[PDB]
Each structure stands twice: as C-alpha cells, then as structure tokens.
C-alpha cells in the first residue's frame, strides 16, 4: 500500500 524506507541516523 505504502512502500517506505525508514533510515535511522545517530549522532557522534
């Protein structure tokens, strides 16, 4: 239905 990519980006 909705094709999604969820990227996680941390910090240091």
């Amino acid at each position: 239905k909705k094709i999604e990519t969820h990227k996680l980006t941390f910090r240091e």
Partner: nanobody, 123 residues
C-alpha cells in the same frame, strides 16, 4: 479523459481554483496529482489526493497552507484551490494520475539510548 481548467492571469495575493474532470473512475480509488512547469524550468510536484482507504493529501512544502486539493466524488472531479498566489507560482499546471512509488524517512536519534528488552520468537 482528463481535462485541466480554471487557469488565469491574476494579481499576487489572488486566488484561482483549478479543476481536473475525469470521465470514468480509473482504478477504483487511485491518486490524482497536480504538477506545474514554468518557462525554462523543470516540472515540480504541487499536490496529490488519494481516496482509497479514506483521503490523504500531499503538498509541496512551498504551497502548504496556501493551496488545498479536494475531490467531488459525484462529479468525478479534483480541485486545487490556490490562495495567496505569488509571482513564483506562475506556470502551466497539469493534472495526472500518479503513483506513490517510495517514501524515504530520515529519523534522527541523539544520545545514549535506554535499556532494551529482548524478544525471542522460538517454537
């Protein structure tokens, strides 16, 4: 059979309402979108509406809070109400069926994260 209409020549701060009238019903409840192109520039997404599992609407950042897309099911017509027009909105506007191929989200997390909990799926 799609037909865009309702264009004009207006002062900044004015309004126009674009219409896109469809002849059939497409795929049952697909996505209809607007895009625009100004002279010497590339095509730019403006807005889209789907009425599949309910209504969702999408907008370019530059037109949020000025433009509203809607659909009159009984006339098989999609509307783009353009308020607070600016000189930079000058273009040819087009309506077309669209498909949303992919959406990419970028989520930021900061700092140490907390205590986690283990999930083990096992017969």
């Amino acid at each position: 059979q799609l037909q865009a209409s309702g264009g004009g020549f207006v002062q900044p701060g004015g309004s126009l309402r674009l219409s896109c009238a469809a002849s059939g019903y497409t795929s049952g409840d697909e996505i209809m979108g607007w895009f625009r192109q100004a002279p010497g520039k590339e095509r730019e997404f403006v807005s889209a509406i789907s009425w599949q599992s309910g209504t969702s609407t999408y907008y370019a950042d530059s037109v949020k809070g000025r433009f509203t897309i809607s659909r009159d099911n009984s006339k098989n017509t999609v509307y783009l109400q353009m308020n607070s027009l600016r000189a930079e909105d000058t273009a040819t506007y087009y309506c077309a069926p669209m498909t949303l191929a992919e959406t990419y989200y970028e989520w930021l997390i900061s700092g140490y994260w907390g205590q986690g909990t283990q999930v083990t799926v096992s017969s």
